[PDB]
Amino acid sequence: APPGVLKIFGAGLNYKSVLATARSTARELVAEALERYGLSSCVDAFALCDALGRWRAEHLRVLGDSERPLLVQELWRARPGWARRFELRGREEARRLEQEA
């Protein structure tokens, strides 16, 4: 329910804070994080990622365009002894890293 701030970290861009409400889509937060790094066209070229590790990410998931990142942040936790953070990444790079086991 309550609006939250999300720390969106840049990789190949340190984080940008973003106000996200429970009706904020991932694609909307991508656009916002993009201009907050100083960049419409290249929204689809980038991707928001739920990333996990122990800083190097050991696994990640590319969020769907109309997924709601606040709820992803809140309704799921990382398994015990794992770090977790949202990341702004090139789409092809991120979709690739989804396979690196």
**Beta-carbon contacts of residue 98 (< 8 Å; ≥ 6 apart):** 60, 61, 62
The reply to whether 55 sits near a copy of itself by the rule CB under 8 A is no
CA 4, CA 6: separation in Å to the nearest integer?
6
Shortest distance, CB of residue 75 to a copy of itself, whole angstroms? 5
14 or 66, CB closer to a copy of itself? 66
H/E stretch holding 75: helix 69-75
Instruction: Assess 1 for contact with a copy of itself (CB under 8 A).
Output: no
Q: Does 54 bind a copy of itself (CB under 8 A)?
A: no
78 in contact with a copy of itself (CB under 8 A): yes
Residues in contact with 43: Cβ distance below 8 Å, sequence separation at least 6, in sequence order? 27, 30, 31, 34
By CB under 8 A, is residue 2 in contact with a copy of itself?
no
Closest to a copy of itself by CB, 14 vs 79, is 79
| Binding of residue 87 to a copy of itself (CB under 8 A) | no
Find where tokens 């977790």 sit: 84
8 A C-beta contact, residue 3 and residue 19: yes
For a copy of itself, the binding residue among 67, 87, 89, 94 (CB under 8 A) is 67
